[PDB]
PDB file of C-alpha atoms in Angstrom:
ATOM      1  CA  UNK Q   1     103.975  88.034 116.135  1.00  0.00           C
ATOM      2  CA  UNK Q   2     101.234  90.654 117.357  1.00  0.00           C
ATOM      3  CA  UNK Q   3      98.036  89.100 120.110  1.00  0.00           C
ATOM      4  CA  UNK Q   4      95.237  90.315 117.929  1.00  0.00           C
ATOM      5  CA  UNK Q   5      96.954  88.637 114.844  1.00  0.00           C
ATOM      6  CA  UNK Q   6      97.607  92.269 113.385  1.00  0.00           C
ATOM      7  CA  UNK Q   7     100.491  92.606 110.856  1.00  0.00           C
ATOM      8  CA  UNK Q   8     101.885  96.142 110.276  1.00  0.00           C
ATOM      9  CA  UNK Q   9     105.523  95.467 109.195  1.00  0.00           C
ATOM     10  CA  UNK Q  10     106.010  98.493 105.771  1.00  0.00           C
ATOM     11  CA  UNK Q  11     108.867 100.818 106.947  1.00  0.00           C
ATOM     12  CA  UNK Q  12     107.733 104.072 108.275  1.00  0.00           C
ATOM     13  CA  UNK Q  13     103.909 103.144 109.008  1.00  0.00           C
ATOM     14  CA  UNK Q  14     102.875 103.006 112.266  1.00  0.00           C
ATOM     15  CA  UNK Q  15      99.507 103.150 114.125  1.00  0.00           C
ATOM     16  CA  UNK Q  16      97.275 105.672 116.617  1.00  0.00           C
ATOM     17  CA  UNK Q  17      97.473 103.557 119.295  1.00  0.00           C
ATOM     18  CA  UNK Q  18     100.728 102.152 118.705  1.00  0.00           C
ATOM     19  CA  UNK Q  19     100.915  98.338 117.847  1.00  0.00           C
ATOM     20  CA  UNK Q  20     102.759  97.636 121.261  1.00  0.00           C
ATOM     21  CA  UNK Q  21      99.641  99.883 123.092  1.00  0.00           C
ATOM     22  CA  UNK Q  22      97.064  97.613 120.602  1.00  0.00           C
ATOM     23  CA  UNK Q  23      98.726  94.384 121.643  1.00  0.00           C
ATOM     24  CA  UNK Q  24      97.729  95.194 125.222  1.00  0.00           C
ATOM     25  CA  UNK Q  25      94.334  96.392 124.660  1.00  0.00           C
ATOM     26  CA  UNK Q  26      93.935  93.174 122.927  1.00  0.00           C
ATOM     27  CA  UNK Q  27      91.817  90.395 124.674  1.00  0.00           C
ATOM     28  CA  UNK Q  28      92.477  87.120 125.715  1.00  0.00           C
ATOM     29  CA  UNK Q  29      91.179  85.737 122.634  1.00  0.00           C
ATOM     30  CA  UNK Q  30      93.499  87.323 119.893  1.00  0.00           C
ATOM     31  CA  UNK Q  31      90.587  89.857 119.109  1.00  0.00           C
ATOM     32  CA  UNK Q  32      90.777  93.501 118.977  1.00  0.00           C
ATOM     33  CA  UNK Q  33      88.747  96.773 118.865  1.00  0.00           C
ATOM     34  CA  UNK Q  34      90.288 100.326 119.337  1.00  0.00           C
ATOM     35  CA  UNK Q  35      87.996 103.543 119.269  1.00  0.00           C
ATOM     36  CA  UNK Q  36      89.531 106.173 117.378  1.00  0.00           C
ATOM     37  CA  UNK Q  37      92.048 104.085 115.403  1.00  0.00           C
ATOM     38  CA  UNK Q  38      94.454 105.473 113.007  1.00  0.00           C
ATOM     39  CA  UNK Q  39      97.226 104.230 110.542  1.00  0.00           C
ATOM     40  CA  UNK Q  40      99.917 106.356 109.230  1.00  0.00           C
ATOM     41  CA  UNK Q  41     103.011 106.155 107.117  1.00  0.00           C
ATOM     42  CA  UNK Q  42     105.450 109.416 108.255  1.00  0.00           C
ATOM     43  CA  UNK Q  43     105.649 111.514 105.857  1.00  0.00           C
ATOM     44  CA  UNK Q  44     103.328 110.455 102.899  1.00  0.00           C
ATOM     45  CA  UNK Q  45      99.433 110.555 105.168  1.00  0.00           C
ATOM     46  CA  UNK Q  46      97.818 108.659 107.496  1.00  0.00           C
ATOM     47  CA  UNK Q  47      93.921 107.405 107.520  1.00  0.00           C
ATOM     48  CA  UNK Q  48      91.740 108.103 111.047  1.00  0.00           C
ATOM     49  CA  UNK Q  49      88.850 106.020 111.682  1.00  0.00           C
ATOM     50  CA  UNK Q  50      87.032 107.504 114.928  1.00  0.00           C
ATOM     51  CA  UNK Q  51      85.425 105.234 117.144  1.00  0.00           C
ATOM     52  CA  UNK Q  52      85.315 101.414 117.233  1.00  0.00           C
ATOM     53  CA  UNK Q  53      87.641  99.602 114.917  1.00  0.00           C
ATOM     54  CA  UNK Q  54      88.034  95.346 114.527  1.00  0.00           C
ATOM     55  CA  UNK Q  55      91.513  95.269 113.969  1.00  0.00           C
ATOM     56  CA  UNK Q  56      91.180  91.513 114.698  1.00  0.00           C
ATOM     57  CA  UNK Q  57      93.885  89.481 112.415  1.00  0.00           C
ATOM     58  CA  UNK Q  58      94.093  92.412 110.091  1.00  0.00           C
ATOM     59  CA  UNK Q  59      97.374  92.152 107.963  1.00  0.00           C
ATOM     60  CA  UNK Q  60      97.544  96.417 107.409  1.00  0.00           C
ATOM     61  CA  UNK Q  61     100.496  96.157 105.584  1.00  0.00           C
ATOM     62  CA  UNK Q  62      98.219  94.759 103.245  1.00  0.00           C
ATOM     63  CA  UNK Q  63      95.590  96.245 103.222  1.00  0.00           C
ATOM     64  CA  UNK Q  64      96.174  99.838 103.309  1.00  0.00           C
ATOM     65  CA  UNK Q  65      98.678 101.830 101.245  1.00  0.00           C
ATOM     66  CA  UNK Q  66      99.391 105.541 102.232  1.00  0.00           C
ATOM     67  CA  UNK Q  67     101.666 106.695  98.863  1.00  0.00           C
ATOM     68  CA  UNK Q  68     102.563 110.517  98.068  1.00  0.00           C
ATOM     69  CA  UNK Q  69      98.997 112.368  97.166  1.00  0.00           C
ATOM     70  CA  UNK Q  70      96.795 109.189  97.493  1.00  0.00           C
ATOM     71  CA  UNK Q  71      95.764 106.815  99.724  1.00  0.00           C
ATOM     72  CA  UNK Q  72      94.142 103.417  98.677  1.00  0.00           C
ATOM     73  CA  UNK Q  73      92.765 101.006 101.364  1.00  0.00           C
ATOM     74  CA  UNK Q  74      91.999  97.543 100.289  1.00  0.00           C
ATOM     75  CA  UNK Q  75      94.578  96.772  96.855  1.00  0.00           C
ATOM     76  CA  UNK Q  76      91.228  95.044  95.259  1.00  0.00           C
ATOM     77  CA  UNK Q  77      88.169  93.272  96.406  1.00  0.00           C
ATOM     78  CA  UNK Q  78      89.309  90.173  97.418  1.00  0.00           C
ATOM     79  CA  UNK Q  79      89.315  90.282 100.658  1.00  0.00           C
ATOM     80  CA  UNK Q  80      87.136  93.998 101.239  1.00  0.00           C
ATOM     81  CA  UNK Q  81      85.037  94.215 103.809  1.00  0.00           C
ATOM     82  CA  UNK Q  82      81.362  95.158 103.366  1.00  0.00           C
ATOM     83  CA  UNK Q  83      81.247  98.901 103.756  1.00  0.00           C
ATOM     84  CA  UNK Q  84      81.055  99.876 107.660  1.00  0.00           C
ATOM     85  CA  UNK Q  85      83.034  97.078 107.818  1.00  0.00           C
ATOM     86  CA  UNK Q  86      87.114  96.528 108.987  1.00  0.00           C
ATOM     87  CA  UNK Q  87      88.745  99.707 107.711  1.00  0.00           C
ATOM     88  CA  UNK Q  88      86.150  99.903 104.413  1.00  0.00           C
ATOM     89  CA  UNK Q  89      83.995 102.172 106.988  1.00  0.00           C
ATOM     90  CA  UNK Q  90      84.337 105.902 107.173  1.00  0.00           C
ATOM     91  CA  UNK Q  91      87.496 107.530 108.025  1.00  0.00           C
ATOM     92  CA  UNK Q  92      89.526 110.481 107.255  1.00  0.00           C
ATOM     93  CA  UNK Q  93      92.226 110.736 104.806  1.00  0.00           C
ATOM     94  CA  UNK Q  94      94.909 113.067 105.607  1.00  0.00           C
ATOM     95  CA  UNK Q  95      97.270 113.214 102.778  1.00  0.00           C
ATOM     96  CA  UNK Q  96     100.273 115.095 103.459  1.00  0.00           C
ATOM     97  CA  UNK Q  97     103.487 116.521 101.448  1.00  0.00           C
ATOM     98  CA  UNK Q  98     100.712 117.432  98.765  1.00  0.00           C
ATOM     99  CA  UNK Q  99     101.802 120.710  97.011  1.00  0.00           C
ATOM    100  CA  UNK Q 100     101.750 121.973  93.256  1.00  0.00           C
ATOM    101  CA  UNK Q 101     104.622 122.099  90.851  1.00  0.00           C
ATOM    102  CA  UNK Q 102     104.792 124.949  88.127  1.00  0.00           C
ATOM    103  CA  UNK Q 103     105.234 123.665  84.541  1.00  0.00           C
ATOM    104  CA  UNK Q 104     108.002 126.421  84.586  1.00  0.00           C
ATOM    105  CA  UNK Q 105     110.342 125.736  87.075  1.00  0.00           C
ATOM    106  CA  UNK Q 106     109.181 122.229  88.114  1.00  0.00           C
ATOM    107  CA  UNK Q 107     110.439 123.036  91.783  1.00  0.00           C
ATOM    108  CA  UNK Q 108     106.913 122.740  93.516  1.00  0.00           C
ATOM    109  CA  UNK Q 109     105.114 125.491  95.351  1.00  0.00           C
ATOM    110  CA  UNK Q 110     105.191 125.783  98.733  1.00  0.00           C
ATOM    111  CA  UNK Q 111     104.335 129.822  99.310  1.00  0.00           C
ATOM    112  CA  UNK Q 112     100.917 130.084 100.933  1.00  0.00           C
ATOM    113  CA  UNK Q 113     100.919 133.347  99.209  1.00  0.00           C
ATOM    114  CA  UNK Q 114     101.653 131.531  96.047  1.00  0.00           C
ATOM    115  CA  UNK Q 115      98.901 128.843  96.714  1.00  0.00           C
ATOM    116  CA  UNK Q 116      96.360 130.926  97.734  1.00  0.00           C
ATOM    117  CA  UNK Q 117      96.698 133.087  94.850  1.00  0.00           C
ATOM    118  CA  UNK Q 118      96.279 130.199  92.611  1.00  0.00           C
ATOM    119  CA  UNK Q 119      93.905 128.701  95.071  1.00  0.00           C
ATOM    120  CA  UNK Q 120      95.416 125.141  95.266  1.00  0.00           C
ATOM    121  CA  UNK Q 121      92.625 124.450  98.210  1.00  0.00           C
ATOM    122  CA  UNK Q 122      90.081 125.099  96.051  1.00  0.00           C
ATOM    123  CA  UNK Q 123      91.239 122.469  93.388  1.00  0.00           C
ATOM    124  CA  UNK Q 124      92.223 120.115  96.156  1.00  0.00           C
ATOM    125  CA  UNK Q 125      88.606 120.197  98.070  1.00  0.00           C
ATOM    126  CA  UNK Q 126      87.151 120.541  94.114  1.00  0.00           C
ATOM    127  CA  UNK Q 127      89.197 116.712  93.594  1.00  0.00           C
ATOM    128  CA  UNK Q 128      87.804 115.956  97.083  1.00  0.00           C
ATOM    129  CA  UNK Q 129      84.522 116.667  96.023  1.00  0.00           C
ATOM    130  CA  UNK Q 130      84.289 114.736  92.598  1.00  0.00           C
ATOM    131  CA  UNK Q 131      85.603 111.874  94.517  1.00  0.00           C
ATOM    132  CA  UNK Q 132      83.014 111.507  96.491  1.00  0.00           C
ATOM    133  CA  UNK Q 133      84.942 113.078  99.744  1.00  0.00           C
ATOM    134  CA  UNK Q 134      84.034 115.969 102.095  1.00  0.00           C
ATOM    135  CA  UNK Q 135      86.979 118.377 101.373  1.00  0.00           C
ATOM    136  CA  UNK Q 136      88.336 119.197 105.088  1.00  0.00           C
ATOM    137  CA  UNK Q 137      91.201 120.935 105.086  1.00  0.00           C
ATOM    138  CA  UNK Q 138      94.826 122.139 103.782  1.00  0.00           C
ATOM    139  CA  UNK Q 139      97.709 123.053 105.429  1.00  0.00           C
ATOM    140  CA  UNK Q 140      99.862 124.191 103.198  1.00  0.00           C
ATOM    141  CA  UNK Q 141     102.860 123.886 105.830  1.00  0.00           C
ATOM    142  CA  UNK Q 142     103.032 120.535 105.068  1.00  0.00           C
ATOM    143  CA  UNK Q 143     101.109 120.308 102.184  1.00  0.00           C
ATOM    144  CA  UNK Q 144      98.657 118.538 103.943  1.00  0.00           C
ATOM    145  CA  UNK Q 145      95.054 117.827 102.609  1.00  0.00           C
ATOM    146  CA  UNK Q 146      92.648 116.041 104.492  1.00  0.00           C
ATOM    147  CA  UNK Q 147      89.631 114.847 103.594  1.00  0.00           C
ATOM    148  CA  UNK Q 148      86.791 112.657 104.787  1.00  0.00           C
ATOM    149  CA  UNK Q 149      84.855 109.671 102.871  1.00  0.00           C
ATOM    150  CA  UNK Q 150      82.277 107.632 103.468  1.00  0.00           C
ATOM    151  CA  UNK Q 151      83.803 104.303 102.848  1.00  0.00           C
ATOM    152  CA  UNK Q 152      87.130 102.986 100.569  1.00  0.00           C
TER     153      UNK Q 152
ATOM    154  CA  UNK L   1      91.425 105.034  95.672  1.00  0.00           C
ATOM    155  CA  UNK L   2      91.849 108.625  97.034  1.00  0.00           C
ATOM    156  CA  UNK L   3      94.264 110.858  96.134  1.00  0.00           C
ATOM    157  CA  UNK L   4      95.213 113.849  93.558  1.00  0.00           C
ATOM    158  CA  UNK L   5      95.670 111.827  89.626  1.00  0.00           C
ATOM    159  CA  UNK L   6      97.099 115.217  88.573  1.00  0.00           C
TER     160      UNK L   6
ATOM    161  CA  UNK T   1     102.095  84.211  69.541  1.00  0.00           C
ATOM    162  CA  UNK T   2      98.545  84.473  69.236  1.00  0.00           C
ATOM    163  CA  UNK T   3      97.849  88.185  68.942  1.00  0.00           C
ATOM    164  CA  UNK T   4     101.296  89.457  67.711  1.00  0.00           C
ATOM    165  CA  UNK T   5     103.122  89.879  70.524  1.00  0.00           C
ATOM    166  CA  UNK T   6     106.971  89.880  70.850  1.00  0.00           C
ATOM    167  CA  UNK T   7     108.862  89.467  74.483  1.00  0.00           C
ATOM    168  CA  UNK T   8     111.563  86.810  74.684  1.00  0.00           C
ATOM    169  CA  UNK T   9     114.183  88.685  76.952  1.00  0.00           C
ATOM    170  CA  UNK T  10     114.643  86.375  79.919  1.00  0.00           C
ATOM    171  CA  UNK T  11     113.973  88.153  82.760  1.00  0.00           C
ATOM    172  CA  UNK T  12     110.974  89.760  81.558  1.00  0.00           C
ATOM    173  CA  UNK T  13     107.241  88.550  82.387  1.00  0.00           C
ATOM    174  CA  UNK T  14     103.893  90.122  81.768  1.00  0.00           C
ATOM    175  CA  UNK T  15     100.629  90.159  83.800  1.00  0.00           C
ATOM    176  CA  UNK T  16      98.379  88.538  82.715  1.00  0.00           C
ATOM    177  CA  UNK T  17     101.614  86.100  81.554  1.00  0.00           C
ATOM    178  CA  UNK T  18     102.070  85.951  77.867  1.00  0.00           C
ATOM    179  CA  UNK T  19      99.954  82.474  78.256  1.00  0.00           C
ATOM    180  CA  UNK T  20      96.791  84.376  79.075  1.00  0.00           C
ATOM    181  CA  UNK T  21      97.640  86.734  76.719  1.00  0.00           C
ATOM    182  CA  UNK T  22      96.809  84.392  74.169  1.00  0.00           C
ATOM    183  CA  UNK T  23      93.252  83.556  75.357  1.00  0.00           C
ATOM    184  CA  UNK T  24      92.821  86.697  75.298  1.00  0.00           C
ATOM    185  CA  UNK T  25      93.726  87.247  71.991  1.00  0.00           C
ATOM    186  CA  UNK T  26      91.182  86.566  68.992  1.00  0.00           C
ATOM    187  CA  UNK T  27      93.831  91.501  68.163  1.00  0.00           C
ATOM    188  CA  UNK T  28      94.900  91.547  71.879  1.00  0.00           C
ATOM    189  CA  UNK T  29      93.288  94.674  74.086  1.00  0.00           C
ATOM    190  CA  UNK T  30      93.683  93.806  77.794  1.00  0.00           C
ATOM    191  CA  UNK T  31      93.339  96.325  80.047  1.00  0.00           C
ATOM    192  CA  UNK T  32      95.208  96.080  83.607  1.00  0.00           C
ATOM    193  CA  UNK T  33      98.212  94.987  81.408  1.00  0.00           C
ATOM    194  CA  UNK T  34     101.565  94.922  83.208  1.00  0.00           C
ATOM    195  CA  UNK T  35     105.279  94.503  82.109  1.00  0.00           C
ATOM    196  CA  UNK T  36     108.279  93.789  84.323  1.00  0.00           C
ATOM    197  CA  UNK T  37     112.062  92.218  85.053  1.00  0.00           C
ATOM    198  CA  UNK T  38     112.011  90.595  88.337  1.00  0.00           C
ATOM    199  CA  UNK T  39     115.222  92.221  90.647  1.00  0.00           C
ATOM    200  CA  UNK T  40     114.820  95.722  88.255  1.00  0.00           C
ATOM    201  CA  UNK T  41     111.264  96.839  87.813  1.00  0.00           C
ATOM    202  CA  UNK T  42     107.636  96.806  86.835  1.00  0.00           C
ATOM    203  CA  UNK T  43     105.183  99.203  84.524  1.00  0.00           C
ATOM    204  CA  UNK T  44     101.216  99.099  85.515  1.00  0.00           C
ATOM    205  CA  UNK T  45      99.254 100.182  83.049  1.00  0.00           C
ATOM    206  CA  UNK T  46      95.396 100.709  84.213  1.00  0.00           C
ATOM    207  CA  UNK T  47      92.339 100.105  82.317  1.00  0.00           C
ATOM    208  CA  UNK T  48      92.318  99.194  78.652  1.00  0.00           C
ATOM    209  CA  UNK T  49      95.496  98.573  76.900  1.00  0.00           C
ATOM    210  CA  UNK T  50      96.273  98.134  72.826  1.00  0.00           C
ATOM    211  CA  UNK T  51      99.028  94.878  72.583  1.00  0.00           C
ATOM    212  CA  UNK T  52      97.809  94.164  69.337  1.00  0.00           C
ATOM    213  CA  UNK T  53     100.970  93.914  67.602  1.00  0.00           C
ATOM    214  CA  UNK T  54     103.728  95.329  70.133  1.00  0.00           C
ATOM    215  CA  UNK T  55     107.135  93.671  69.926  1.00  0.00           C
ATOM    216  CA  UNK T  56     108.164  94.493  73.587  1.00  0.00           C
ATOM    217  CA  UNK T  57     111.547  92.723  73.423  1.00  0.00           C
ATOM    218  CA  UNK T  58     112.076  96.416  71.021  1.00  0.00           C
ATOM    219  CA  UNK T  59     109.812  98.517  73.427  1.00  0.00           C
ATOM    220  CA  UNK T  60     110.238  98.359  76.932  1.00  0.00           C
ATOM    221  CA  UNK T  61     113.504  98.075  78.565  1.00  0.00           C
ATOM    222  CA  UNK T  62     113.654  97.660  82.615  1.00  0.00           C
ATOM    223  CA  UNK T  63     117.154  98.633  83.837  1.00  0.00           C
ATOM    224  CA  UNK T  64     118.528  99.188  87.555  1.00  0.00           C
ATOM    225  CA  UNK T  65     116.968 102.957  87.984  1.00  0.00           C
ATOM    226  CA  UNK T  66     116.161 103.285  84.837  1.00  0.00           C
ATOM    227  CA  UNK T  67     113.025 102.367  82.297  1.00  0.00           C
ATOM    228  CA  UNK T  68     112.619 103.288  79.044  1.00  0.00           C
ATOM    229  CA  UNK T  69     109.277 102.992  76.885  1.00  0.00           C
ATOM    230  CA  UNK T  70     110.247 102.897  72.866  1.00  0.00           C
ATOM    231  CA  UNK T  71     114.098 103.527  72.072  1.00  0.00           C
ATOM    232  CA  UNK T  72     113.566 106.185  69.074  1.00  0.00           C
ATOM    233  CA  UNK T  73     110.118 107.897  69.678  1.00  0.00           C
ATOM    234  CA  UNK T  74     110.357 107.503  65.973  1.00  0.00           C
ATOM    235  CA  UNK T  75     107.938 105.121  66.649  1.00  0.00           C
ATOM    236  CA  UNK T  76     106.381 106.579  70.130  1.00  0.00           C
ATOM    237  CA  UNK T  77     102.886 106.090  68.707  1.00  0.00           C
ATOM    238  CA  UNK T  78     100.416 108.926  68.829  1.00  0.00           C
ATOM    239  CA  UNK T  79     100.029 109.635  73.014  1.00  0.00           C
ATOM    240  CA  UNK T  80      97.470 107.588  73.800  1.00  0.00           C
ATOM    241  CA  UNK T  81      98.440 105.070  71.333  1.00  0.00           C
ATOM    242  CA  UNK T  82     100.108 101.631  72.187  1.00  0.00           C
ATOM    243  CA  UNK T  83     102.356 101.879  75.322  1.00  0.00           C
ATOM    244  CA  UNK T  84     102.820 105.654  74.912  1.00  0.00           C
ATOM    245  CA  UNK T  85     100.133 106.336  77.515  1.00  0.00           C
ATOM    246  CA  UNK T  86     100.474 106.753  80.876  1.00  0.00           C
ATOM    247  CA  UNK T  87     101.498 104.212  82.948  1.00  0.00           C
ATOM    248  CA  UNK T  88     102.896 103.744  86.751  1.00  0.00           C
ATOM    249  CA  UNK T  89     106.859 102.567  87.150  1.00  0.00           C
ATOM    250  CA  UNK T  90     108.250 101.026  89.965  1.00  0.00           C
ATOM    251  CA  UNK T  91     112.146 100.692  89.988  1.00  0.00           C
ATOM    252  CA  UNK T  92     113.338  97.977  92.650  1.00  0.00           C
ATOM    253  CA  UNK T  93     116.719  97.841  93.763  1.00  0.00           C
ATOM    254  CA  UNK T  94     117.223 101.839  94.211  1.00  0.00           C
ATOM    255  CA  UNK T  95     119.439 102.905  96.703  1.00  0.00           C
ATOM    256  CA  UNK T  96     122.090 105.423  96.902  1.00  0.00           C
ATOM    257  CA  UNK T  97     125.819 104.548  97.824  1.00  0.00           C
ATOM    258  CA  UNK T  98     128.286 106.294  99.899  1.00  0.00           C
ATOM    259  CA  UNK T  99     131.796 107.734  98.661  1.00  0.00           C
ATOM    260  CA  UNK T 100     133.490 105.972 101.135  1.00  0.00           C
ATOM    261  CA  UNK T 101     132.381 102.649 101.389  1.00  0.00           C
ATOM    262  CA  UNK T 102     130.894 102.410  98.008  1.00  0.00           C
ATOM    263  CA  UNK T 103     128.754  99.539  99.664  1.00  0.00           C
ATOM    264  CA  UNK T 104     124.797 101.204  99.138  1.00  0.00           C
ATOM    265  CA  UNK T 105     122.875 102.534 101.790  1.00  0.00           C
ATOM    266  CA  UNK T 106     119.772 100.282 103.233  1.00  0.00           C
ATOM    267  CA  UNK T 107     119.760 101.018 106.525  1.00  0.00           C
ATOM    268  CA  UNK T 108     115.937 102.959 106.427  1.00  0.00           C
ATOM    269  CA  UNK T 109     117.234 105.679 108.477  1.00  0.00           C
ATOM    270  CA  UNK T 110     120.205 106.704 106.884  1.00  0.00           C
ATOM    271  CA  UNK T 111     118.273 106.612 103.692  1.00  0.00           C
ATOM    272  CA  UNK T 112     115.572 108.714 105.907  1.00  0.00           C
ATOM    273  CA  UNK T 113     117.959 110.738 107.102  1.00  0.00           C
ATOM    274  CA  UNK T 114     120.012 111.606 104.291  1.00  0.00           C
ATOM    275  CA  UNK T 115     116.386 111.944 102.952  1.00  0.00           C
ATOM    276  CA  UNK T 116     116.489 109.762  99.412  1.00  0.00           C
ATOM    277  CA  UNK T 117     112.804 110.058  98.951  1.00  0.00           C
ATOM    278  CA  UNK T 118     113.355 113.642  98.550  1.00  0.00           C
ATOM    279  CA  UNK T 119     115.978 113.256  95.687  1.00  0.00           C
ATOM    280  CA  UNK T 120     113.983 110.571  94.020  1.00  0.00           C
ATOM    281  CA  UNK T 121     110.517 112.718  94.450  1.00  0.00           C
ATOM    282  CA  UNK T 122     112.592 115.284  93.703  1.00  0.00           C
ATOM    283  CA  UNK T 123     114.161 113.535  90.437  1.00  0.00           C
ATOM    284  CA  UNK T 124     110.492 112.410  89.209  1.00  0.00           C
ATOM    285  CA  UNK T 125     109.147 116.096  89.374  1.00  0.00           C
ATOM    286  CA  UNK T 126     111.842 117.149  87.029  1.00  0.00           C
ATOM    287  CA  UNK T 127     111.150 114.614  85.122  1.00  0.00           C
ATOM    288  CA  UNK T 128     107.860 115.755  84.572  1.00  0.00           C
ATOM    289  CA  UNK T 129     106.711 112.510  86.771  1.00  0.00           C
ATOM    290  CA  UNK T 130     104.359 111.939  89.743  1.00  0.00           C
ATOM    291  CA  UNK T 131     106.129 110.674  92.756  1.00  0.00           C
ATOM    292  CA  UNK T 132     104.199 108.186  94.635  1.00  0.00           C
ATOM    293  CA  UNK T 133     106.497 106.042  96.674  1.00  0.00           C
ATOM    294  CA  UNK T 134     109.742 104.498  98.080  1.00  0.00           C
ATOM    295  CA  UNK T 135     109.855 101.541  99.857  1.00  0.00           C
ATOM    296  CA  UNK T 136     113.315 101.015 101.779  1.00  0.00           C
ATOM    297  CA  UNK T 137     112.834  97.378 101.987  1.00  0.00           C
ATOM    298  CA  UNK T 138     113.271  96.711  98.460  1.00  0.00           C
ATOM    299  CA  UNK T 139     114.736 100.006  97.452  1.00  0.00           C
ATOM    300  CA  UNK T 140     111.442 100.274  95.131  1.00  0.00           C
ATOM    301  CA  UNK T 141     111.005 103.958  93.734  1.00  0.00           C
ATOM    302  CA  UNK T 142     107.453 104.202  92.102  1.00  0.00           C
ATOM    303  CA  UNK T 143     105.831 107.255  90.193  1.00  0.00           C
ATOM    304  CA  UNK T 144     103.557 107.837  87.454  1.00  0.00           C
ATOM    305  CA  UNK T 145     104.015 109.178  84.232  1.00  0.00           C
ATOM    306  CA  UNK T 146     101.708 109.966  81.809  1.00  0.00           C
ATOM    307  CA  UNK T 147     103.722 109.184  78.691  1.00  0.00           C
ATOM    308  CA  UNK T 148     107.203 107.664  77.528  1.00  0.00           C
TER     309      UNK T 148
ATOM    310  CA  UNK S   1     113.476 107.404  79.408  1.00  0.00           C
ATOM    311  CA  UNK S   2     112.996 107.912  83.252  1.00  0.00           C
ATOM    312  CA  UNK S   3     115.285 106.870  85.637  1.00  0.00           C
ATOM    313  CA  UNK S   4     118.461 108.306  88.160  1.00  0.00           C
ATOM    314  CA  UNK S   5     121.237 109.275  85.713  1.00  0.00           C
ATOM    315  CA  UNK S   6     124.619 109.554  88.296  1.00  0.00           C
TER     316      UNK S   6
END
């Protein structure tokens, strides 16, 4: 099991380096720190933390859960970090397959034309905002919304 | 927790 | 028990465990309440939650793929009310099975590949559910719901 | 009721 004591074992998340490139970068001593770090689950989102990370004995699977329209690093405070701290520093969320259903047909809503005239960005970046994220972007190709915070 | 709670 | 509260179905356990529940108990609000069958599947329900007098052995039933929250809404409390609100289900065991073999389909990329998340997203949105998650390993399909 | 009916 993994040199810097990292655990990343959920089906379909991987990691930006890959585990196998972290386990290389890793020194002699089990520890680990990757600039520009990120964790994704295909499909669902991914998290990007830019710059130095301590990946050091972090058990991922874990700690961070990428699900369909949220992300949620660190279940509960047990074992969070102080802020700037392991993956409970600043990063950006990327949340993809996100896309509106209409009550109507329940079939979601995947026209740019369609979102754009009921301005699904400007909901998604409005959520963004009362969270307490910076609203970056939306691609509505994928139905991806990313977003910045501060912290998790 | 991040996401849409739609 | 305590603060009337009815669950004898084996198979079926409650966080905090009906114990706790008791302590709690003087009525019976607890919020983060949760109600599952180990092998079928869980409900989460966040934040404050009325058990006052619920007789869940009646309420809640956790079958392979399926919940169900109160048998004849004839008693589906006011939304809001009792277990009526909304709540997060996660359904272990799902998988799909092939014609052929009739043997169920693990393997996470045949399931990727024939794409079950999409059918069960799919199958929550018609539903009128939110689709967060399914988890090969254990064949868990989780999603929200808002009401039973 | 929620669930996979088939």
């Amino acid at each position: 099991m993994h040199p810097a004591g990292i655990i990343l074992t959920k089906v379909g998340y991987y990691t930006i380096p890959s585990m196998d490139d972290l386990a290389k970068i890793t020194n002699e001593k089990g520890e680990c720190i990757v600039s520009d770090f990120t964790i994704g689950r295909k499909g669902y989102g991914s998290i990007y933390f830019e710059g130095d990370v301590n990946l050091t004995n972090l058990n991922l699977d874990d700690i961070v859960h990428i699900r369909r329209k949220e992300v949620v690093v660190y279940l509960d405070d047990n074992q969070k970090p102080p802020v700037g701290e392991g993956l409970n520093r600043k990063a950006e969320v990327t949340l993809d397959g996100v896309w509106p259903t209409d009550k109507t047909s329940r079939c979601l809503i995947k026209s740019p034309d369609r979102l754009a005239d009921i301005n699904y960005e400007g909901r998604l970046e409005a959520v963004s905002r009362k969270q307490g994220a910076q609203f970056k972007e939306y691609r509505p190709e994928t139905g991806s919304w990313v977003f910045k915070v501060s912290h998790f | 927790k991040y996401g849409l709670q739609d």
